[PDB]
Design a protein around this ligand. Structure first.
Ligand SMILES: Cc1cc(C(=N)N)sc1-c1ccccc1
Ligand SMILES: Cc1cc(C(=N)N)sc1-c1ccccc1
Ligand SMILES: Cc1cc(C(=N)N)sc1-c1ccccc1
Ligand SMILES: Cc1cc(C(=N)N)sc1-c1ccccc1
Ligand SMILES: Cc1cc(C(=N)N)sc1-c1ccccc1
Ligand SMILES: Cc1cc(C(=N)N)sc1-c1ccccc1
Ligand SMILES: [Ca+2]
Ligand SMILES: [Ca+2]
Lengths: 227, 12, 227, 12
């Protein structure tokens, strides 16, 4: 692609600069370029990839919800047309991320930390497709499958306070609540995740304790909304 | 749309 | 361009939707499309045009300053390259706006409200070019000239509380302070503008008074910083 | 860069 002539290290440096500049579309394109070099990503590089596309799709999701709400209240073709424009661009970003994961991040990821990270992302970007889907069932089952494989590996291979495991459970629980229409499964997962992490905090350093409790607080926030 | 907490940047 | 097949009214409707969705690049492209229909713009349409491009260039300016500061502290080619990338895109947006104003918004604007609005914009987008210029003199003089013609018309044709006149003087004063390195001219203009507006507030309705005092407060804010 | 007040959206 357009980044094929730039060094991998330069793409990573510029992704970090684009983050500082809040230039997340640039950040995402630089990290896409880095992935397409074909080498595995480090922990820091995986986080750069995720932060970039989360910011990009986050703006599109927020736009889509504004337009969808206007559209629903309005029910001329303009509101529908422009909602469809934004929806199509959002689906394109999701398709791009899923393509990176499938070609070939997931298959080359052998360590639990990398494989769970990528399978969580796969679940997330199928979930974002599900939010706009109206084939919705197949999309939902693809999110569930990715999340479920990530959970199984995380439960075998990672401590219950591991931040990737915690963020996976948080997002899978939200999937259950509002995509799968399984609010009891959502609440159950969030509770069990919070409680098993609480009982393992005593093993952690001050810095790891801060990392884990920050995501535990998100689980708590959702439980407060849900119960 | 009430949005619940998910991992990483609350970008939406 | 790409908007040539969409109705003028649909482009305006979608610009309003894109504003609500905080999709300012879309908003700008829709309003560019509307301008290129060749009809004059209404007051509301002029404001849509200005808000759209101000948000777009505002993001680029903020990014550029982040990168410029990193670059200056750093003095590999990456920081310079990426600053140049952002700078080039910012200059392209400015060039686009200036092209709309020159083809043919300004020449068809006969009313003082429309002509001052567009000449203010011309000053602003040459000022944004000046902020990144290192031909800087010619760019600065093009901003000054546009602002000066706008001021002359506004002083002849508009009351001193008119919000367009007030926003023009505010921005011209900032031009003086930090582009032209004339801080005394800046302070003088802001003071005289504030005082002549204060003495005309008694002529205004409640709603017009709120419009004018909001921009007077920006003049005050700057004077507080400058003195 | 201290930015002074200018008209319209404080978008930067
Ligand atoms: C959450 C975060 C954001 C960062 C940035 N914007 N540079 S670095 C960072 C981090 C996290 C864990 C361990 C070391 C650094
Ligand atoms: C967790 C995180 C988020 C980051 C970012 N936003 N840049 S960098 C980062 C990290 C991870 C491992 C080692 C060093 C830095
Ligand atoms: C079903 C599917 C699988 C995808 C992938 N693996 N990249 S992208 C995708 C999709 C969904 C909605 C609209 C356009 C494309
Ligand atoms: C400042 C502003 C923002 C608006 C919006 N986002 N829709 S409408 C508006 C305005 C201003 C003057 C007279 C009538 C409406
Ligand atoms: C001043 C302004 C800003 C606007 C916006 N952001 N949409 S619309 C608007 C206006 C102006 C004249 C008559 C009706 C609306
Ligand atoms: C001097 C000038 C006049 C312009 C116009 N009327 N559109 S655009 C422009 C410029 C400035 C810097 C970099 C690229 C283009
Ligand atoms: Ca459209
Ligand atoms: Ca670059």
């Amino acid at each position: 692609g357009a980044m094929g002539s730039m060094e991998r290290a330069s793409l990573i440096q510029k992704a970090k600069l684009a983050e500082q500049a809040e230039r997340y579309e640039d950040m995402a394109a630089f990290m896409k370029g880095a992935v397409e070099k074909g080498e595995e990503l480090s922990c820091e590089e995986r986080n750069l990839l995720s932060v970039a596309y989360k910011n990009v799709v986050g703006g599109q999701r927020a736009a889509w919800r504004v337009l969808s709400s206007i559209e629903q209240k309005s029910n001329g073709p303009e509101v529908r047309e422009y909602r469809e424009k934004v929806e199509t661009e959002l689906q394109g970003v999701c398709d791009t991320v899923l393509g990176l994961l499938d070609s070939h991040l997931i298959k080359e990821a052998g360590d639990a930390e990398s494989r769970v990270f990528y399978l969580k992302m796969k679940g997330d970007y199928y979930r974002y497709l599900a939010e706009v889907a109206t084939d919705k069932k197949r999309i939902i089952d693809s999110a569930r499958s990715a999340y479920q494989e990530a959970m199984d590996i995380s439960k075998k291979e990672m401590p219950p306070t591991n931040p990737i495991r915690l963020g996976l459970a948080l997002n899978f629980s939200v999937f259950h609540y509002e995509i799968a229409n399984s609010p009891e499964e959502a609440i159950s997962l969030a509770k069990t995740t919070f409680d098993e992490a609480m009982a393992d905090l005593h093993t952690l350093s001050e810095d790891s304790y801060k990392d884990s409790t920050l995501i535990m607080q998100l689980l708590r926030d959702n439980l407060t909304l849900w119960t | 749309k009430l949005m619940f907490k998910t991992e990483g940047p609350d970008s939406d």
